[PDB]
């Protein structure tokens, strides 16, 4: 088809860009193709596309972006119940939404880079563009710090993060996945990216994040999390088993409770683990 | 007129040199009166010029004393009032899925009316907070406090007329201000006791409740209290005892623990180590922090003029009080 | 109507709460055709005192039906508006009901809503129309906040219950029983563990209801909860009220159960309606609680009662607590008709209503 190809094309011009933003761009672009003038036909065709896209890419971010797009179309449906000017106004609002989501990363970096002090040691788990941007803005602010990255045994992405950080002239250091407890005392704060924010405040991240959060809680170490707004998902896992199996697939993801998180840096502002629930309730997604 | 300028300069100088109004209520009242005066006798037509003028003056007042956040709170409150009144006369995730150059006529009068309403509410906050004393205090109860706070003093002495309890007061080492509070409480027959900070944990096994006052409330529900409150909260959390904070709405600042080192106010070491020690003062490094940081996780409840609430809802009060664009000021 | 006299010696820590006896009722000093108090309110107070209606929603439903009857039977006097007359006339009835038995949070919220609605009636509208509108508002409120809210909470909790689960319930709550019965009828295959406590022994109600429904159930007392939790997979609890600080006010044996559950690493869930969300705050059960009849502590063990005559000993006290409060740090999820929300989102829902 065209959905698969367009998704892969948007993923390929810029590797940097996340999967959910690319999926939202593909959905809005396919919205221009729509010929049916009935609302359930538009709804079902687009929902089919979002499920197929989610099948292609097993990630929580893609599903979150799809859920947000359907909720935004439902609001634009409660506009007038028209689907005559509704498609037009919806396209404009969607373009505005895309431009706004583009600046999310810069807003998160400019808001989170202030919590890093000169001479402090940072502890990161895996590669993430958001934490990389935060660190680049901190070093851009005439700051000096040391970073410890976990190798991320499932896929050697921690080494990629360390390479991209050492390229910015920062004394990075790679540690073993089993050494997260040995270097926890030599870290002043922990900053990691989140793949998806659950209803209560927890985060769905790489398999090696919950144990690090546990060690941080055991040593009173600030555990900060950086994530965008399009990663908010209406899930409520009670333990490591309540997480959907489609997101885990040696699992590739785990859930972290909000009691182990100190603060959250999102494009909407710096928030606590409980404010995200209020935001999700306000959206009624 | 230059009288406004003379008043602004005097206010900035008195805040930067030493402390001004002793009570926080008087500080907020003085700030609100100065803001109302700046609004009344000044050349402003549009909302943007007035807001920028207030922003520059408030920035100056805050730079004069950064630990005095009650003034930044009043400036931000006045800014929010101006924005709301301008939107009333001119016309998140759910939201996401502005010029101030129009010049009206009755904007100044209603701004002043709103400021007077805020003043009357500021005046009534003390009784509104003190009225909730019997809901948390019981007979033959033991209460522990630290320092000297008018809000906590009223909260405690308002329930002594109908309940009988034992109050423990821990003095502050740099400025022993708890003695005055203990004396004022004993003057009303509450069976008060005075002690040092070193015996906080040693005596915190027979305590049943803790009620304290703060200087400002941060955004994530943490406090900037006098030195010694962090240890009190730690002891409370170790013994799983509720820690109540009686603070009005004007003690709420829209900032998270972003900053570093300039959080606490450092005064001369004369209070900690006297000047008559000898030559060891050239080698010994003495530090005297007045305030400290108390995380939100160690707090249990916040008794305000609009009723008690949990720290996990203070963010909403922030969204309700201040505008996100006026956080930096 | 005279004061409801107390019974027995109260405890030193609960010396500010009333302590009554079920044998001595307050309807003894009243006229047989009740003149000052409405007959419906008299019967309701008698049922509350005798323990015939024991439950948060059963009490609220009975109170609302009695109020409907009173409004149907009440005619407004002349030279006065009805909007204030009905509130002033209902005040002593509420006083009498409180004298019979302390009111619950559900009853308080219902009375507040009814007073607001009565005050909202205009002075120009007629009497029959206003009475009909009040009766209809009462019925729609019951339908929306009790029956439809219970269906929405059961529909939301059905996804949390899975096959092979071991759910642990406590006390008697109609919402939990309905949730379990609907999950069992929808095809889920699990087993419930019923925990009970003295002296009410109301868990047997849910036990028999589940046996009648066909769900495999177990029964045991609360001191042995630490023995059955290792095999328990979920803990479903009912709540009578949710304070503004997120703390859960429910039956006395809930906070201890939640504490033991967290120690055994078992996720705890709470089911409550939005009309039971109280705006007040409390940190522990000492400053505000309810002391039931102390003679319920007496037990026939062996051939003699050790507490047969407890009042002879002036040093012996009998404490019979009813409600208790749980901190938000021991509650994992809260189920409501709005959706599954954490416990630290209780004020946000209070915001929207």
mmCIF file of C-alpha atoms in Angstrom, chain C residues 3 24 54 68 93 126 142 154 167 176 180 198 208 212 232 244 258-259 290 335:
data_model
loop_
_atom_site.group_PDB
_atom_site.id
_atom_site.type_symbol
_atom_site.label_atom_id
_atom_site.label_comp_id
_atom_site.label_asym_id
_atom_site.label_seq_id
_atom_site.Cartn_x
_atom_site.Cartn_y
_atom_site.Cartn_z
ATOM 1 C CA UNK C 3 -32.057 14.356 73.539
ATOM 2 C CA UNK C 24 -33.040 2.108 74.153
ATOM 3 C CA UNK C 54 -27.119 -1.188 57.095
ATOM 4 C CA UNK C 68 -39.957 12.026 48.558
ATOM 5 C CA UNK C 93 -35.971 15.930 60.654
ATOM 6 C CA UNK C 126 -46.874 26.603 41.664
ATOM 7 C CA UNK C 142 -30.771 8.163 42.311
ATOM 8 C CA UNK C 154 -18.666 -2.504 36.888
ATOM 9 C CA UNK C 167 -9.703 -11.494 44.389
ATOM 10 C CA UNK C 176 -18.148 -4.971 44.772
ATOM 11 C CA UNK C 180 -17.988 -9.613 40.722
ATOM 12 C CA UNK C 198 -16.507 -8.937 64.360
ATOM 13 C CA UNK C 208 -23.971 -16.065 50.330
ATOM 14 C CA UNK C 212 -26.001 -17.969 44.972
ATOM 15 C CA UNK C 232 -4.287 -13.608 46.677
ATOM 16 C CA UNK C 244 -10.144 15.675 49.514
ATOM 17 C CA UNK C 258 -4.513 -2.349 52.679
ATOM 18 C CA UNK C 259 -1.393 -2.136 54.853
ATOM 19 C CA UNK C 290 -18.620 6.668 65.109
ATOM 20 C CA UNK C 335 -12.581 3.064 39.946
#
